[PDB]
A paper describes a structure:
Here, we show a unique type of Cu/Zn-SOD from [name] (DrSOD) with an additional β-propeller domain. Each domain utilizes a different metal ion—a copper and zinc ion for DrSODSOD and a calcium ion for DrSODβ-pro—to independently drive superoxide dismutation and lactone hydrolysis, respectively. pmcCu/Zn-superoxide dismutase (Cu/Zn-SOD) is an antioxidant enzyme found across a wide range of organisms, where it plays a role in detoxifying superoxide radicals by catalyzing their dismutation into molecular oxygen and hydrogen peroxide.
Under these conditions, crystallization occurred at a relatively acidic pH (pH 4.0), which likely hindered the zinc binding (top). Also, the zinc-binding loop, electrostatic loop, and S-S subloop in DrSODSOD were not determined, possibly due to significant structural fluctuations (top). Nevertheless, the overall structure of calcium-free DrSOD crystallized under acidic conditions was nearly superimposable with that of the calcium-bound form crystallized at pH 8.0, with an RMSD of 0.305 Å between calcium-free and calcium-bound DrSOD in chain A. Both crystal structures contain two molecules in the asymmetric unit with no significant differences between them; therefore, the comparison was focused on chain A in both structures. The side chain of Asp339 in the calcium-free DrSOD adopted an orientation away from the center of the β-propeller, resembling the orientation away from the calcium ion in the calcium-bound form of DrSOD (bottom). While it remains uncertain whether the crystals obtained in the presence of calcium ions contain a mixture of calcium-bound and calcium-free DrSOD molecules, the orientation of the Asp339 side chain pointing toward the calcium ion was exclusively observed in the calcium-bound form.
Residue numbers in the entry: 25 to 80, 89 to 100, 122 to 160, 172 to 462
Write the structure that this text describes.
Amino acid sequence: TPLSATAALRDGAGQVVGSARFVQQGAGVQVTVDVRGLTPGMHGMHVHEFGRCTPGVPFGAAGGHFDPPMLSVGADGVGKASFTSTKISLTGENGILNRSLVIHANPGARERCGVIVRDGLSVRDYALPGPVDHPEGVAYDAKKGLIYTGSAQNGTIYAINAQSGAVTKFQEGGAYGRQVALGLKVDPQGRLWIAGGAQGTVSILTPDGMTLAVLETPKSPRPYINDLVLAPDGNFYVTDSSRPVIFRVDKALKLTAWLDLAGTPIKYGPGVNLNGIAATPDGKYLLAVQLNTGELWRIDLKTKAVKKVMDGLVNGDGLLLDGRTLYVARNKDQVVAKVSLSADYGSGQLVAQEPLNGLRFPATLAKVGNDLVVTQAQLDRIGGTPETPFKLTRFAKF
Ligand SMILES: [Cu+2]
């Protein structure tokens, strides 16, 4: 099934007066435009940054021209175009899904606008209320029907009712160990486990929203506790994307350095190293992705032996293991990758990469009922100018 998108082109009164169709063909996008009611001659036609066609001037809410192709309308006011472009894409870091197509007046004012909507793939966005939320980790409590997601900027955990979308503050951030929230997991007791980023902490909250414990790691320079996972053996394993160590938290809540990575094939370098982590359901292995190198690693829980599984996942962030299928959020690339794993988890093949309906720095993944949810963290905009509202996006497995 090809990657394609459609934009229903509206005029200022909100009437749909045309359509633009986009079909990905390798590196190029085939574009077809049909629109009526325009003045004869050549018209500027550009992608703008936001997928909104409401006033901001008419169509001002579309924002500026998207930069990281002229429409000719005959005497009857009908504009017709058909070309292939290598300057746009429906996927990757510069993909145009959920942006807008705007037609201008001169070869000028904005005369037509349409939101570019992915064909054949339904999604549900859950908007968050704050100006700097930067939701990073996500987890789901199926018994309560609540999605939890945490702010990488200030540590607040929001609870989202998965059916209604209603957002509440599960626990405000700011306390010791609670100033940053990255990877999240819900354990069988309904407790929320929270990776603490540069605080070097792992925090645990009970389902009432109260803190149970803040666990510290050793004080050494540049801690960055990134993500964690509960293995079948009952232990949590915790990645640090800056310090070459994997931590373990046992059932009694004792945190230890479990594997020193120096001298293993995992070589830490500049940037984000191990971050997403998963546990195989047979209890034999951890899988962890190294973002900066793009390498996926298998770690034997009994011997601590390390094996490379595959390469090609640069910018790989959160992991979600579903049998022999591994989903990998690739944050800069704005896609969710799908990996098929061998039976001993010793090799893998990258089989698909989904841009969904447009993603802004997707960071982590969780299962919600029969679906998946991904955070649009926009972490590349932290301290800068993110698009608001921040959102989580729920979508079918693939
Ligand atoms: Cu423009």
